[PDB]
Amino acid sequence: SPHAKYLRECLSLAEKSPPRPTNFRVGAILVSRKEGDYKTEDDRIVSTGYTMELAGNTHAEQCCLSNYAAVHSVPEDRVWEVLPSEPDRKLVMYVTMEPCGKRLSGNLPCVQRIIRTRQGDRKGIQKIYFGVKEPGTFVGGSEGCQMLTAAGIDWQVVNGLEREILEVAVAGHENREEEVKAALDT
Template identity: 50%
Template sequence: MDAIQPGDHRSYMQLTLDLAQKSPPKPTNYRVGAVLVDLASNAILATGYTLELPGNTHAEQCCFAKLADQHGVPEDQLKSVLPSSMALYTTVEPCSKRLSGNLPCVERVLRLAGSIRTVYVGVMEPDTFVSHNTGKQMLQDADIAVELVPGLESQILAVATAGHIKNKPNLETQV
């Protein structure tokens, strides 16, 4: 892959979409991709996608867990070893609640507040995914900018819902 130029949000979002396509299509999961970028060097620090790691894992969770493992620290101490200016790209707005018992992705991002400056999203989480997602507001309240990257919305939603039974009610309990 050619290097992505700094500020080329569309190319970074395309990369997150490519990652999301690696996630297995299932009727109870949304296929999401995530990329964490060091803004100073434009280096990709970590990537992740839904179900990349064992368990009911989300893209951001996999991204941060892999990076923590790479640095030999627990995920909740990841901020101590990371650059001070990063951006997170994710195909879908980070979740604000999970019924699986796993920490919501927005809370994982908030642990890196001050280091993650901006979260770039391909689509805001539709209410048909998890209703009343407050991720964007929680991030903004912590002075983390949330920016929509337009142009790939239909592809992102098609990939996210691959494997779902159409006209099925909200699968919130499976998230």
């Protein structure tokens, strides 16, 4: 029931991203939630991020994790060491678009950044909610979801915001409206 509201908040974050011809403007919010029959009032925000918030070609989930790493004085690849890990609460990430499993640049894709939060005695991110089953990349597809499943990370599509998520995501693109159609038809 709170998922649509979190995704709208993710979309507001995405709107902070600079429109560019080749980026996908996405927002992400990391939440600590009680396991079981939880109450939304007990959710705690752990971090937020959006595309290109941090210098260079950075994705929303990447920035969300890197923001937390910076606040906790660790390199971003070591954010797993500092993310919350309490057995009765789980970490859930909301993100407007499906986390990428492949990138055009040489940068590590977002699903791999998510999977590596589960190391040692740290539970890591247990579930991803997103609003469109397309990644924030030109590659498209579902490879991110396949890798999450293979790694034991739950995911769930939250319907009802697809057009707005795509319109924001591709705002900087030359033929954005035609591209939004192609995605909505897919």
